[PDB]
Design brief:
rod-shaped, mainly alpha, 2 chains, part of a larger assembly, Major vault protein (chain A)
Chain lengths: ~50, ~50
């Protein structure tokens, strides 16, 4: 019945959306770091072979 | 780092061989030049003595 209550719940749903976007950005950052380290390791082994 | 050390072992073996070659070549060259000069001086000293 109270409008303030519904307005308070809108902040809850926008915080849930912000949480989901932060989660996908963190997953992308960790995949980027894994590929970066794999390429760096292959590059170092190739420099020693050269 | 484990894979890089696996190849770095063979790199260090080849560098050990190259250092061996360089050091023994330098020492052999200098010693043989001094021995040749000494032999020529010795035969000259024989002829001077006569």
């Amino acid at each position: 019945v109270d409008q303030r209550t519904r307005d308070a719940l809108q902040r809850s749903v926008q915080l849930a959306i912000e949480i989901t976007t932060n989660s996908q950005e963190a997953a992308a950052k960790h995949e980027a770091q894994r590929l970066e380290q794999e390429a760096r390791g292959r590059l170092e082994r190739q420099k020693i072979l050269d | 780092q484990s894979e890089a050390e696996k190849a770095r072992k063979e790199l260090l073996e080849l560098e050990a061989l190259s250092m061996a070659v360089e050091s023994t070549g330098t020492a052999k060259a200098e010693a043989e030049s001094r021995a040749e000069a000494a032999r020529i001086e010795g035969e000259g000293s024989v002829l001077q003595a006569k």
